[PDB]
Each structure stands twice: as structure tokens, then as C-alpha cells.
Sequence to fold (600 residues):
Amino acid sequence: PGKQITLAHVIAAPIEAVYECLGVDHEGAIGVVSLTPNETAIIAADIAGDAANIDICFVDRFTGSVMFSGDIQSVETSLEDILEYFKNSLGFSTVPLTKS
Amino acid sequence: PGKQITLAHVIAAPIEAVYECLGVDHEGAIGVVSLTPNETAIIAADIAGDAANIDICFVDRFTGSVMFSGDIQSVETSLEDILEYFKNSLGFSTVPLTKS
Amino acid sequence: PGKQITLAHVIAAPIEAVYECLGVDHEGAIGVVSLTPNETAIIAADIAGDAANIDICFVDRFTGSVMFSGDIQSVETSLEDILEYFKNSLGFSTVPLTKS
Amino acid sequence: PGKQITLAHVIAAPIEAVYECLGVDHEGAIGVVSLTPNETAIIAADIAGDAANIDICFVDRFTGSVMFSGDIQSVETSLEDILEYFKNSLGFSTVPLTKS
Amino acid sequence: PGKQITLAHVIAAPIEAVYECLGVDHEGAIGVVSLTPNETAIIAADIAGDAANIDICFVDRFTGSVMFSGDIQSVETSLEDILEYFKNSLGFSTVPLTKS
Amino acid sequence: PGKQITLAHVIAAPIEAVYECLGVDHEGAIGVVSLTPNETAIIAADIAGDAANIDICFVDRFTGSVMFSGDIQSVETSLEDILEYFKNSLGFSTVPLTKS
Fold:
């Protein structure tokens, strides 16, 4: 399993402690993404950030982690776009989108 | 699949968060490369760095990852050169070049 | 393909970023070797290190990777010696030596 | 080729980098063994370890790899014993012993 | 040679390094089995595990490998039972039991 | 012997280690099948999976291996159905069903 997206998750209604942890304006969902190789977090962050309304929280190229905030709908589109591109273009094996 | 280039990607128009993550002067594209064996990231970085105008961001010999910044055209040539050499000379099985 | 040398490469003129990555004195070529089984990187490193003028950068027995620095001529001899011994003595199927 | 010993090698005079890689007391030869099936590295390690003076470096049951240190003479006997038992008792097709 | 048991070996007195490699309580013999087809390692493990006193170390269905620990006598019975069933019932061509 | 079913086995009472190896809910028998040509594991898996209550563990088209879990009775019917179809329809030479 070379190129894998192992997580593409959305937190619809986060809590104070979750917002305070990331440093967000406590208004919107949070999209979380894990993929290998770890460096392609930079490419995932680019596609998530194309929405512009979406705010990039952190991009970790060492662990392969991306997080971003914004309206529930924008986050779902950003995750959906990441999964679709990486699958079709970059030939990744993607996991289904998940909600909490 | 011993000798493989699994990614040879170019980000034409990166965002603040992507630039800030790598520590670039927020002016140009970013070329991303993943290959196995992981040590040959050193050889890929050499061919990408031959352009000189191209700036090597990071070379990870453990994961097999290379990133570099510069004008969209320089990055494409660097990626094209890496794919061509590794394929013809080093007998790698290369993936097609990708744009985002 | 049990016993294989898949890479026996020399980088004649490396760059700052390549030197800084390995931690070399920025003066000489770099010999890169990949072989299977992965443990025989220890035997390859021994033959490369017999030159003494050659400096062993890293030996990875898990991936089957060896790297070493020194004058372009010393590195070529070390790679040539590795290829010749492994082929004739240890009955490996070796790839041709490559330059970048 | 079901049951094969593909390597039964001794490094008479290893170098700092080779010792440092394995984590040995920089005093003696190193015996290297590769065999298939990979699990029988456990049986090879047992026969090499019967000498007791011989120190088992690593036993990899996944790749089929064994390494051990000690006086040049002890290592040769251990390798010779492994080759002789596996050939005569376990019906393996063994390669000749090799020195570097 | 479709259905073959190529190894059915017992290590009467294993060493620290052999125990530490498998992760056993350093008290008893180790039974090692290799057979083709590789999937029938699951059936061999079942017959070895029927003794209950015997502890299954690992079952590899890809390589066709089984290992298990316990008192020398229990391991011999388990190996003897595997050889007898596979030979008589499953119509395998079995190798003789071996001791080290 | 072109078209052969060499194994059509059922494990009535598997153990923790056998379940953990396959990744089953530790409740039911395991049906194991080996046939040549190796690709027809896909056809055998189809007939075993027609029961629906039966869960397909793995289908290997390279080795010609099928495994599946479920109630002892369902597994026996699935194996019986595979043997009957392959024999009568596909003109295979089948081995007798076996229990452990």
C-alpha cells in the first residue's frame, strides 16, 4: 500500500476544547485528512485551500496530516475533491468520507 | 516493483499555508517526487537541482521524498528530466507527470 | 530474482542540498548502491570501505542501501569492485554502473 | 528451488561503519546467512549460537537473514556447521562459503 | 509436487536470541513447519494448537510457515500429528521429522 | 492433470490464533480450497459466496486458494457445491471433502 488516503473525516459540530486546540473562530466544521506518502499532505492542503472560504489549520508533511475549518458544506466539497483527484489523477486507494 | 517513481507532481499555484509550510518566498510552483528505493531521492534532487534556478525544499532519503520551488516551467523541466533519466538510465517504472 | 544489485550509481558533481542531506564536507562524488537481500548492504559497505579514502555515509540493512563519498575515481573503483565481487563470488545479477 | 541457502558469507576484517551499523564491540569477523524458506533463519541462528562464543547480531524470519560476530575461526565453523546440517539433514541446496 | 510438507523441524534447546526473536517465555522447544500450498499453514496450526499446552508463535498463509512453543514432548507429538494427518487424509508427500 | 481441486477442507473448531490470522469474529468453521488452474479460485469463491451467510476470507488467483467462514453446515454445503459443479460442469478431477 504505497499511495493511500487512510482518513478523510469531517467533524460537523466540534466543541470549545477542539476549537481551542486548533485555534479556530468556533464557527464551522473541521476536515481531517491522513495519507501516505506523508509529503502529499502539501497537495491535499492545496485542493482543500482552493475553496478559499476554507481555512488551513495545519499541514504536517512528516506525518501526512491536513486539517481545515469552514462551513460544513465547504469542508465536505474540499474532502470530496481531495478523494476524487488523488483517486483518479494520482492513483491513490482512498477510504470513504466519514462524519462525526 | 523494486525501482518505482510513484509521484512526479507539480503545484502550479500554491497557497500561503503551502508556502509557509515549506518556507518558500511565495513566488513559483512546487515539484513533488516520491520514489522507491527511498535513498534515490538524493539522485532525483541532484537532477532537479541541476536547473540551479530551482530551489531544493527538502530531500528525505528514509521515505524517498523530494520537493523544490521555482518558475512553473523550470519545475516541469526538472520533473520531466527526473522521469526521463530514471526511466531510460536507472530502469525505473515511472508514473505520468500530474498538475494541480 | 533472489540476489540482485538493482542500483550501483555515482553522482560526480553533487549540490549543497545533497551534501547537507548526507552531512559530507562538500568535496567529492557520492556512490549509491541498492541490492537484495537487504542484509548484504553490510558486505557492499565493507568492499566500498576497503579504499579507506572512501567515507561510508550510511548502511541500511533493512532496505538494502549503501552510500559513500570521496574523489570521483575512488567511488567508481569502489562501485566497480562491489559489482565485480557480488557478480563473480556471491553470484548476484548486477546492473550496469550509472553516472549523474 | 524450495529449500535454498543463497548466502553463507564471512567478513574477516570489518570496518568501524560495519561494526557501528550492527552494534558490535569492534573485535572479530561477521557471519552473514540468507536462506529460503525465510522462517528457517531461526534454525540457522540456533546452530550458529551453539558455539556460544559467537554473538547473534539479528535474526529476521520475514526476509530469511542471520548475522553473528566472534573470532574469524568460530564464525567459519558456525557457517560450515549451518551449511552441513541444512544440506545433509534438512535437504537444502547450499551455496559455497565466501570470504571478504 | 502440489501438496508437500518440506520442513517439520523441532528445536529442542533454543537460545535467548531465538526466544527473543519469537517472543516466548524462554522455556521449551520450538516446532517449525513449511508446506505448499501456503494456505494450509492454517490447517497445520489447527492440529498443532489442538494440544492446547502448545502456544502458536506465528501462522503465515502467504509463505506457508507455522511455528509454536511448549515442552519438547508436546511439540514432537504436534509435528508427528501434522505429518500423519496431511500424509494419510490430505494426501501430502511429507519429509521426515528433524531435531536440532 | 490440467483442471484439479487438490484440497476442499473444513476446519470445524478453529482456535484463537487461526481466527486472528484470518481476521474472523471467532464464531464458526473455515472452508479451505486449493485448485489448478489458479485463476478458477474466482469461480470457486463465487459458488461459496452464493450462500451469503458464508463470509469470503481471501481469494488468491495467483496460487489458486479460497478461504471462507460461517456455521459448520453452511461451509460443508459451499465446499460440496464447489466440488459438485467443478466436477460435473467444468470437468475438474476433485479430491474428497476433509474435516479437522
Remarks:
- Chain C touches chain D through 20 residues (CB under 8 Å).
- Strands of chain C lie at 4-11, 29-36, 55-60, 65-70, 93-94, 98-99.
- The two ends of chain C are 27 Å apart (CA to CA).
